[PDB]
Amino acid sequence: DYKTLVLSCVSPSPEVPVKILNCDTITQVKEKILDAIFKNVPCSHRPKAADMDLEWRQGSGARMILQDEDITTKIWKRLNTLAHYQVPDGSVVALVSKQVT
Amino acid sequence: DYKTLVLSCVSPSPEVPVKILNCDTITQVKEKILDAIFKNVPCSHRPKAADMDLEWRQGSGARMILQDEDITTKIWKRLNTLAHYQVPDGSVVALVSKQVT
């Protein structure tokens, strides 16, 4: 499948609606979100996709970390996408920094 | 010193005048040039500063490669800047890809 959906991204202030594809890997999703939320920051001074995690803030109140590979990936392993996780259009998401230590 | 100057950057079409500081390292100069010349390309799909070299296209007709460290660096080594190379305001420059093999 190759379809667009919208994610409502929490500001790193109002949420920002960002278009991505349902077939983008989670790393590719994170890249598009960073492009939107840090649009006026030079590339050199933006956080990198690989240093951040995507957090799905469900209507249930659960906050789930989505990534390219986890316990939900089926083994050749296909990289995880929003379609893999069945994320609905309009879902609320945040980017969360990774602990370095 | 901490002063601005303009470089006239060859399109990767007309040259693009880009502001940088005379104390920016050459890597920092390259980053600012990339920000200008690829402004509408997402960060993910831009060439990286470290994979490109800065070429000074002198009025003499000479084309010189400038970089953070070379035979002109004096030894603790300070990283090279445009002031180090005595590049005049308004100089013409290009970004050149590095051979990978």
UniProtKB/Swiss-Prot annotation, chains A, B:
- Compartments reported by the entry: Cell membrane
Domain of life per record: Eukaryota
Q: What does this protein do?
A: Coreceptor for SEMA3A. Necessary for signaling by class 3 semaphorins and subsequent remodeling of the cytoskeleton. Plays a role in axon guidance in the developing nervous system. Class 3 semaphorins bind to a complex composed of a neuropilin and a plexin. The plexin modulates the affinity of the complex for specific semaphorins, and its cytoplasmic domain is required for the activation of down-stream signaling events in the cytoplasm.
Name the family the entry cites: Belongs to the plexin family.
Subunit:
Interacts with NRP1 and NRP2.
Name by which UniProt lists this protein: Plexin-A4
The organism encoding this protein is: Homo sapiens (Human)
- Lineage of source species: Eukaryota, Metazoa, Chordata, Craniata, Vertebrata
**Shown part of the complete sequence:** 1496 to 1603 of 1894
